[PDB]
Specification:
This is part of a larger assembly, with chains A (89 residues) and B (52 residues). Chain A is mainly α and 89 residues long. Helices cover 38% and strands 0% of the residues of chain A. Chain B has three helices and no strands. The chains are: A mainly alpha (89), B mainly alpha (52). The interface between A and B is small, with 11 and 10 residues. Chain B: This is ATP synthase subunit 4, mitochondrial.
């Protein structure tokens, strides 16, 4: 079917210069190469944050400590205030 | 006063367990904190590959 065959061959061929052989695109005056594989190759990381979100920041946990390892001047005040709270108990 | 003191019969034997097991159940979860670090890292990795 020369209807079918010639329509389908032009259907394959006129984008075959756009996809198979990298001859840019004869009918399009803007180019096709510096849009998706060059400019928006950083597209999703122009859609997300670069260098913290996509590099993902393997970050060390900020180390919190115990109560500064001082169990004298605070525990005896706790025991005196506990005398006070038991006088309230 | 006998009854008021006898309310405090076995307090110390049990509160020496209370104190220790209470502060252990407070403070045995820095493992979970450092697990949270890995969880949010894999969270960000899943998010960015969802973006890709």
């Amino acid at each position: 079917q020369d209807l079918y065959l010639r329509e389908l061959k032009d259907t394959k061929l006129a984008p075959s210069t756009l996809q198979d052989a990298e001859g840019n695109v004869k009918p399009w005056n803007p180019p096709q190469k510096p849009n998706l594989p060059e400019l928006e190759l950083q597209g999703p990381e122009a859609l997300k944050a670069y260098t913290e979100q996509n590099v993902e920041t393997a970050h060390v946990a900020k180390e919190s400590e115990e109560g500064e390892s001082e169990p004298i001047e605070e525990d005896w005040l706790v025991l005196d205030d506990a005398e006070e709270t038991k006088e309230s108990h | 006063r006998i009854d008021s003191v006898s309310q405090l019969q076995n307090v110390a034997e049990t509160t020496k367990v209370l104190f220790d097991v209470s502060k252990e159940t407070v403070e045995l979860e820095s493992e979970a904190f450092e697990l949270k670090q890995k969880v949010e890292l894999a969270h960000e990795a899943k998010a960015v590959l969802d973006s890709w």
